Amino acid sequence: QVIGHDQVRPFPQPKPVTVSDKAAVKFKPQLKIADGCHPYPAVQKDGSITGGLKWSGPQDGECTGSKLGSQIYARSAWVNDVWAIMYAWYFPKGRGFGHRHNWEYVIVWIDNPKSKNSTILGVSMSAAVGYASQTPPEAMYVDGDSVKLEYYYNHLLGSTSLQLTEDTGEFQDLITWDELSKLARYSLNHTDWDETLFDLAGLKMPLKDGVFQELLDKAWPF
Ligand SMILES: [Mg+2]
């Protein structure tokens, strides 16, 4: 069930059909890698999951990107009359000393996914302190409908985190929660990504059942 990180095959990004999928594609964020790994696929169609990378401090030529591509994930829901799109990225390891595996996320809060004029009302993310929310995001941080984020090491908090940025970032093929295979969805609901005995690394998969809704309520920026 566990396969090499550099061998996990991403899902292709389908042409979106459902209202939920169309909105998730429309508002796909972009990601600039300032520090650490590029994002990787965590799971493939048959449910096999990535083995990630052991933490081994500074290393040249590890996790710069899979030969098979990359991935970004999204799950969406109505929260207090606002449509929340939570995007998540997986990385094979993460600093802050560090750990195998990593997850980061950005929530794009929009008014109405069904509207041709759907609009970003807010953004929240896995920031170094709190969720670094903006309601709405400043224009300098948004490229069209795409929020610009940076994956970085915050050296004051000692955390691997996301922040908004003016700089252009990279896009990844999007697979939405509803369009995952049953097997892949099971693996993401059920895998423990934290190797510590007492779960101290904060490595819950942010889109999974019983984390997803709770995170949306915690991050609520309005
Ligand atoms: Mg982090």
| Alpha-carbon separation of residue 103 from 99, 151, 182 (angstroms) | 11, 11, 21
> Which position has the token pair 């004051």?
156
Measured in Å, residue 210 CA sits from the centre of ligand 1 at 19
φ, ψ for residue 132 (rounded to 5)?
50, 40
CA distance 77 to 182: 19
Measured in Å, residue 22 CA sits from the centre of ligand 1 at 28
User: Strands (DSSP E) along the chain, which ranges?
Assistant: 2-3, 30-33, 49-50, 72-79, 82-95, 98-110, 120-125, 142-143, 146-154, 159-164, 174-176
- At a CB cut-off of 8 Å and minimum separation 6, what does 161 contact? 104, 126, 127, 128, 151, 152, 153, 154
**Which structural domain range is residue 93 located in?**
2-219
Question: Would you say 11 and 175 are in contact if contact means Cβ atoms under 8 Å apart?
Answer: yes
End-to-end CA distance of the chain: 41
Measured in Å, residue 95 CA sits from the centre of ligand 1 at 8
Residue 41 has a CB neighbour count (10 Å cut-off) of 26
Question: Would you say 159 and 203 are in contact if contact means Cβ atoms under 8 Å apart?
Answer: no
Question: Would you say 128 and 161 are in contact if contact means Cβ atoms under 8 Å apart?
Answer: yes
List the resolution, Å: 1.7
> Which position has the token pair 């396969």?
3
Burial of 95 (0-12, 13-18, 19+ CB in 10 A): buried
Measured in Å, residue 127 CA sits from the centre of ligand 1 at 7
Beta bridge partners of 152: 161
Count the domains in the chain: 1
Measured in Å, residue 27 CA sits from the centre of ligand 1 at 22
Measured in Å, residue 98 CA sits from the centre of ligand 1 at 11
Tokens found for residue 221: 């920026």
